[PDB]
């Protein structure tokens, strides 16, 4: 089972990042997993933005010659974020998320067959510019579920398949690109053979 999806985030030079970036559990409402979940990390990156401000100062050589100097100065504000899933350590079965897909600014989620959630699911932020379609209804949102099979990432495995962490999908789970997150691979699994 599925237990969501958190990104904690962290401000490294005194800025407003974390705004975008952060993003709270559906099930705990804090960035942590349900009981009987245990959090898997999925990345940690340092998210970069220039922000460039003109400035003008004025300097005087010996207090009696004033001249005044015009030059814009560039800093980067960087935050860093960790992005995590929950995963089920133990086994309540009727408990969890239902998965609806992902997709990005630039690429589709083949659910839908555009840049959108399914009927009755909520895009959770992940990473950058990741959405996951995730829905907690289960009688009216099982119509557009997809069985998940775990995310895995190029630093951590999939604690699905079956000691440490294999990056592969388990069973009759196929693996698909989620997102590249700076040069590092993002993948999840659903069932083999839906997408077509």
Same mark, same amino acid.
């Given at each position: ?8 985030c962290?401000?490294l ?10 993003q709270? !559990?559906?099930?705990?409402?804090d960035?942590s =997993? +349900?009981? %009987? $979940?245990s &959090?898997?990390? /999925? ?7 220039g922000?460039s ?8 050589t010996?207090?009696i010659?004033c001249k005044?100097?015009?030059?814009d ?7 860093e ?13 009727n408990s ?9 600014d630039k690429?589709? !989620?083949?659910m839908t067959?555009?840049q959108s =959630? +399914?009927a %009755? $699911?909520? &895009?959770?932020? /992940? ?5 996951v379609c ?7 949102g099982?119509?557009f579920?997809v069985?998940?099979?775990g995310?895995?990432?190029?630093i951590?495995?999939n ?6 962490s ?5 069973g009759?789970f ?5 997102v590249?997150?700076?040069g590092?691979?993002?993948?999840y ?7 077509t």
């Amino acid at each position: 089972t599925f237990g969501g999806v958190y990104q904690e985030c962290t401000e490294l030079s005194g800025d407003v990042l974390c705004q975008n970036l952060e993003q709270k !559990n559906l099930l705990t409402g804090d960035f942590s =997993c +349900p009981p %009987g $979940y245990s &959090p898997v990390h /999925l990345l940690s990156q340092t998210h970069e933005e220039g922000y460039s401000r003109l400035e003008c100062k004025k300097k005087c050589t010996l207090k009696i010659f004033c001249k005044t100097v015009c030059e814009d100065v560039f800093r980067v504000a960087k935050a860093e974020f960790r992005a995590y899933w929950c995963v089920a350590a133990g086994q309540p079965d009727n408990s969890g998320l239902l998965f609806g897909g992902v997709f990005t600014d630039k690429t589709i !989620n083949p659910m839908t067959n555009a840049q959108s =959630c +399914p009927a %009755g $699911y909520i &895009p959770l932020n /992940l990473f950058e510019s990741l959405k996951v379609c995730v829905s907690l209804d289960y009688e009216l949102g099982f119509k557009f579920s997809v069985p998940f099979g775990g995310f895995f990432s190029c630093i951590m495995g999939n604690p699905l398949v079956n000691a440490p962490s294999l990056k592969k999908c388990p069973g009759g789970f196929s693996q698909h690109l989620a997102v590249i997150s700076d040069g590092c691979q993002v993948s999840y699994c659903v069932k083999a053979g839906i997408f077509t």
